[PDB]
């Protein structure tokens, strides 16, 4: 029953056992009913901790396979590979959840936005680890997910809406690190910060936080 699986999922979270949490929220999703706000957040938190770990590990094992030029290098390489593949299976579990259940049943704009962001987010992670040939097409799947989320949030949400702000934040990152367009990342992040600040004249806590993260990115990227 959705309820029981959801309760175990919250328990897993409390235990910081995120694989557990993702598995519970995965089967909740597979029941085929539109997720509530609370259920979508739990799916999102679960899977984000699950991929975070692999991404942070890939980051360390990559750099090491970088500092070296021995037979340490072949070792790093294959470990970096084992990790990539864990990372991809995770991304694909999620992307399949999105295609097959989450996006088709999303009945509200807020919702369609949330899931198109997350689709952007998970192709982006696949992009960080793509090896050229598949890469240009993974990058386009990501940017098309973002762009649609982005057009829908512009038409449908206030500029201070956390989900619109969060989309802005991540789409700017994507320009920056994936597409190598710092100029486009800065101006996207700048307009989103500015429009949010002007529409100061509501739970602010989440919103003002992302505004802070948008400004920090702009400071970082302007040296």
């Amino acid at each position: 029953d959705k309820n029981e699986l959801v309760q175990k999922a919250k328990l897993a979270e409390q235990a910081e056992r995120y694989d557990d949490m993702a598995a519970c929220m995965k089967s909740v999703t597979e029941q085929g009913a539109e997720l509530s706000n609370e259920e979508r957040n739990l799916l999102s938190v679960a899977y984000k901790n699950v991929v975070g770990a692999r991404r942070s590990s890939w980051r360390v094992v990559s750099s090491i396979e970088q500092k070296t030029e021995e037979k340490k290098q072949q070792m790093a390489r294959e470990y970096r590979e084992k990790i990539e593949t864990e990372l991809r299976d995770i991304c694909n579990d999620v992307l399949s959840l999105l295609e097959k259940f989450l996006i088709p049943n999303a009945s509200q704009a807020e919702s369609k936005v949330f899931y198109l962001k997350m689709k952007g987010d998970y192709y982006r992670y696949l992009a960080e680890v793509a090896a050229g040939d598949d890469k240009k097409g993974i990058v386009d799947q990501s940017q098309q997910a973002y762009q649609e989320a982005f057009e829908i949030s512009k038409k449908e949400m206030q500029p201070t809406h956390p989900i619109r702000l969060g989309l802005a934040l991540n789409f700017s990152v994507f320009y920056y690190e994936i597409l190598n367009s710092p100029e486009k990342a800065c101006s996207l992040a700048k307009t989103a910060f500015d429009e949010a600040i002007a529409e100061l004249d509501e739970s602010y806590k989440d919103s003002t936080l992302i505004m802070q993260l948008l400004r920090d990115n702009l400071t970082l990227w302007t040296s």
């Binding site: 957040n41 999102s44 938190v45 984000k48 991404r55 987010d121 960080e128 969060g166 934040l169 991540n170 990152v173 690190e177 992302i210 993260l213 920090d216 990115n217 970082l220």
Partner: peptide
């Protein structure tokens, strides 16, 4: 550290 959305 990719400076995107936390939770």
């Amino acid at each position: 550290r990719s400076p995107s959305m936390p939770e």
